[PDB]
Every structure is written in C-alpha cells, then in structure tokens.
C-alpha cells in the first residue's frame, strides 16, 4: 500500500478542497446518493486520517 506524500502537508490539501467542491457540485446538480454522508465526513473536522480513502470514495461517486 504505497502512500508516498510530500513532507509539506500545507498546499497538498488545496486540491482536496477543489475535489470536495467538485463532488458537492456533482451531487447538487446530479443527486445520486444522500448528502448525509457528506455531513458525517467533513474535511474541516480533521477526522479524515486517510485522505486517500476519501479520494477513492469521491472517485467512486463518479
């Protein structure tokens, strides 16, 4: 399970903001699943200890 990441974990999460914005836009314009999961898992709660899993889920919505 390769999870190489840069030591500077400051600007890497900006693309996370863009990804979550895109996912929110897709679900709003194209409602596929309930939005309760989005409320439960919020990037601002710091509970995303595995951002790769969050990205995989977001892509799974694709």
């Amino acid at each position: 399970v390769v999870h190489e990441d840069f030591q500077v974990t400051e600007e890497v999460k900006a693309l996370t903001a863009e990804i979550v914005k895109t996912i929110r836009d897709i679900i709003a314009l194209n409602p596929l699943y309930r939005e309760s999961v989005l409320q439960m898992m919020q990037a601002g709660q710091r509970v995303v200890d595995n951002p790769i899993y969050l990205s995989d889920m977001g892509a799974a919505l694709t």
């Binding site: 600007e11 900006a14 693309l15 903001a17 863009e18």
Partner: protein, 62 residues
C-alpha cells in the same frame, strides 16, 4: 480560508495597525494560493481540452 493558527496569530497582535497589516498579509497570501490553484486547474483543464474535439463528437454519436 487561513488556518486556525493564523487566526490565533492575528488575535495575538495588539496594536490595531499591526493586526490590520497581518490580516492584509494573510489575505494576500490566501489570494496568491487561490490564484495559483486556479491557474493550475485551468492549465490542466486546457490540457484535457488538448484532446481533440473528435472526442466530444464521438460522445455525441454515442
């Protein structure tokens, strides 16, 4: 979108001009980061657009 640490640092400043200048600097840094992210996203979107319009025409045909 500055982190909570930046907000605490701003709150630490006592003199009104000092805190105002720190807030302006934080705004400038956030704007620069957002502009860099937007430019990178635009470049990536154009590179995807580098794919011929034949792709879109085939999508229409399907």
């Amino acid at each position: 979108g500055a982190e909570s640490h930046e907000l605490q640092d701003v709150l630490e400043e006592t003199n009104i001009p000092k805190r105002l200048y720190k807030a302006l600097s934080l705004l400038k840094k956030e704007f620069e980061l957002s502009k860099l992210q937007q430019r990178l996203g635009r470049e990536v979107e154009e590179k995807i657009k580098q794919t011929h319009r034949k792709e879109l025409l085939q999508e229409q045909l399907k």
